[PDB]
Amino acid sequence: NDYCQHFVDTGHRPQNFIRDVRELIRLKDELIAKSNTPPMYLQADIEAFDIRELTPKFDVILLEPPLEEYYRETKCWTWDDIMKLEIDEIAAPRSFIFLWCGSGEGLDLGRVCLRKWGYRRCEDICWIKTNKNNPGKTKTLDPKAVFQRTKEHCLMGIKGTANVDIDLIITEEPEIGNIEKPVEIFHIIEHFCLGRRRLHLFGRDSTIRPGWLTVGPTLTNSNYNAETYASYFSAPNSYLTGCTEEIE
Amino acid sequence: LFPPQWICCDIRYLDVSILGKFAVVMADPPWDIYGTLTDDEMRRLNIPVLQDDGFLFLWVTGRAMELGRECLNLWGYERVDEIIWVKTNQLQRIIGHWLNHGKEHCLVGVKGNPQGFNQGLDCDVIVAEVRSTSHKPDEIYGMIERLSPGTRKIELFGRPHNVQPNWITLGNQLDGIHLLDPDVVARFKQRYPDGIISK
Ligand SMILES: CC1(C)CCN(Cc2ccc(NCC3(O)CCN(c4cc(NCc5ccccc5)ncn4)CC3)cn2)CC1
């Protein structure tokens, strides 16, 4: 079966036909839940905001700038803006980054960004969108596109010195104007057990999550306090992965 | 000449100027990440003479995700798409020190201003069964044929199973030289009158 030919024939994307899309080890999810800090969040206009106000330095940064391409039929950030963020100024010397790059020029400029901030790309996580509910909805293509674009990439980067998860996320394509990314990206990130200082830049009220500091222009409320936040990670809690028992 | 054609050769040393121009180039290089090519060898490949206007398909893995983008730009292409092949077994279930890998990547570059291609007929995800080791999915040839039907194509680092109609395949494990296009045959004998490919 050639699912590419079938897509040409019917408009059903090939990913519509991936299935499941005998062991469990989710004492880790429970350990992550026990270690998680209270959710913290700050309304802040990131273009106008000195990023260095965010302390201490972060172990994980999830960066989700609102690209124009997300608003097909709908303040966007360009890769010019994104590349000028001072992300190295707030990343811990050993730390990870997860950058949603879309499906166009971001696959290149997002790599420039990672290198500019001092990361090496170590994984390429593809969000593959099915159209099971809408086989008959043609895509309005980017002028440079050769193919219909049915996925987004979230690049993972590491700086400083497998497991359970795969480098694919498969969900149905969201409704028009819905910019949200699959929450499964948080599970992948948290399953790495990378440390407990987790920052989500350009998050929203709808993405606030225990174990995370969310910073973004559209948040309606803030509870961020730098001294309070730093106190979650002061001794004896400095080095924890977020995947180990709390210390008595 | 439409039927499959191929040249057993060392792609580092063949004079590709004898092959003419192609609507599509595809390469699945043995990146230095077996009989591989160093990064400098890849950069030096004479890809620019192969096309005036058209597309290049470049398979990449690991750090070749970045090196392949470097080569693509060095040879004069802009990357305008990225196909991923989700690897399945026969029952459509999915088969790198941080995540298990469910896919392979193929960069799509453009050179010049291609005219008369059928852009947007296929989508950028392939779902297909793994065959042998390092064997790319045959679905890519059908996607390329629908994109650019009837045109001349060239594959670099192909194996015998890769030979296809409308394609000229190059690789050092191919069986001899099999050329049917009269223009290529003429230029090949002029350039290689004794049938040997050396420096
Ligand atoms: C889609 C994927 C899963 C497919 C696999 N890819 C990685 C990959 C690509 C290719 C191969 N193998 C195929 C070849 O064997 C073909 C012929 N071939 C050469 C080489 C040469 N010059 C150098 C040279 C010559 C002699 C001695 C030393 C160096 N010139 C001409 N043909 C070497 C490669 C295996 N894996 C991942 C994605």
From Swiss-Prot, chain A:
Q: Where in the cell is it found?
A: Nucleus
**Site-annotated residues for Interaction with METTL3:** 108, 111
Q: Name one GO molecular function term.
A: mRNA m(6)A methyltransferase activity
Result of mutating residue 111 to E? Reduced RNA-binding. Reduced RNA-binding
Instruction: List the keywords (alphabetical).
Output: Differentiation, Nucleus, Phosphoprotein, RNA-binding, Spermatogenesis
State the GO CC annotations.
nucleoplasm; nucleus; RNA N6-methyladenosine methyltransferase complex
The chain's disulfide connectivity reads none
Give the superkingdom in one word. Answer: Eukaryota
Residue ranges annotated as coiled coil are none
Where is region (Positively charged region required for RNA-binding) located? 111-120
The answer to whether UniProt assigns keyword Cell membrane to this entry is no
Q: Which GO terms describe its biological process?
A: forebrain radial glial cell differentiation; gliogenesis; mRNA destabilization; mRNA modification; mRNA processing; mRNA splicing, via spliceosome; mRNA stabilization; negative regulation of hematopoietic progenitor cell differentiation
Segments for region (Interaction with METTL3): 19-20, 103-104, 121-124, 144-153, 163-167
Q: What coarse category fits the chief subcellular location reported for this protein?
A: nucleus
Main function: The METTL3-METTL14 heterodimer forms a N6-methyltransferase complex that methylates adenosine residues at the N(6) position of some mRNAs and regulates the circadian clock, differentiation of embryonic stem cells and cortical neurogenesis. In the heterodimer formed with METTL3, METTL14 constitutes the RNA-binding scaffold that recognizes the substrate rather than the catalytic core. N6-methyladenosine (m6A), which takes place at the 5'-[AG]GAC-3' consensus sites of some mRNAs, plays a role in mRNA stability and processing.
Q: How does it assemble?
A: Heterodimer; heterodimerizes with METTL3 to form an antiparallel heterodimer that constitutes an active methyltransferase. Component of the WMM complex, a N6-methyltransferase complex composed of a catalytic subcomplex, named MAC, and of an associated subcomplex, named MACOM. The MAC subcomplex is composed of METTL3 and METTL14. The MACOM subcomplex is composed of WTAP, ZC3H13, CBLL1/HAKAI, VIRMA, and, in some cases of RBM15 (RBM15 or RBM15B).
Please give the family membership noted in the entry.
Belongs to the MT-A70-like family.
Query: What is the recorded name of this protein?
Result: N(6)-adenosine-methyltransferase non-catalytic subunit METTL14
Q: Which gene is this protein's source?
A: METTL14
Q: What stretch of the whole protein does this chain cover?
A: 117 to 393 of 456
From Swiss-Prot, chain B:
- Phenotype when changing residue 162 to A: Abolishes methyltransferase activity
Task: Please quote what the entry notes about the protein's domains.
Answer: Gate loop 1 and gate loop 2 regions are adjacent to the S-adenosyl-L-homocysteine-binding site and display large conformational changes upon ligand-binding. They may play an important role in adenosine recognition. The interface loop contributes to the heterodimer interaction.
Question: Under what name is this protein listed?
Answer: N(6)-adenosine-methyltransferase catalytic subunit METTL3
In chain numbering, where does the site feature Interaction with METTL14 fall?
66, 69
The segments labelled Positively charged region required for RNA-binding in the record are 93-101
Induction summary:
Overexpressed in a number of cancer tissues, such as lung adenocarcinoma and colon adenocarcinoma.
Known partners and oligomeric status? Heterodimer; heterodimerizes with METTL14 to form an antiparallel heterodimer that constitutes an active methyltransferase. Component of the WMM complex, a N6-methyltransferase complex composed of a catalytic subcomplex, named MAC, and of an associated subcomplex, named MACOM. The MAC subcomplex is composed of METTL3 and METTL14. The MACOM subcomplex is composed of WTAP, ZC3H13, CBLL1/HAKAI, VIRMA, and, in some cases of RBM15 (RBM15 or RBM15B). Interacts with NCBP1/CBP80. Interacts with EIF4E. Interacts with EIF3B.
List the residue ranges of the region (Interaction with METTL14).
78-82, 92-103
The free-text tissue note of the record is: Widely expressed at low level. Expressed in spleen, thymus, prostate, testis, ovary, small intestine, colon and peripheral blood leukocytes.
Q: What is the effect of changing residue 28 to A?
A: Abolishes methyltransferase activity
**Covered residues of the complete protein?**
368 to 576 of 580
Q: What is the effect of changing residue 98 to A?
A: Decreased methyltransferase activity
Cellular localization per UniProt: Nucleus; Nucleus speckle; Cytoplasm
Which stretches does the entry tag as region Gate loop 2? Answer: 130-138
Q: Changing residue 172 to A: reported impact?
A: Slight reduction in methyltransferase activity. Strong reduction in methyltransferase activity
Function of the protein? The METTL3-METTL14 heterodimer forms a N6-methyltransferase complex that methylates adenosine residues at the N(6) position of some RNAs and regulates various processes such as the circadian clock, differentiation of embryonic and hematopoietic stem cells, cortical neurogenesis, response to DNA damage, differentiation of T-cells and primary miRNA processing. In the heterodimer formed with METTL14, METTL3 constitutes the catalytic core.
- Coiled coil segments of this chain: none
Name the segments for region: Gate loop 1.
Answer: 29-38
- Residues bound to S-adenosyl-L-methionine: 10-11, 28, 136, 159-162, 172-173
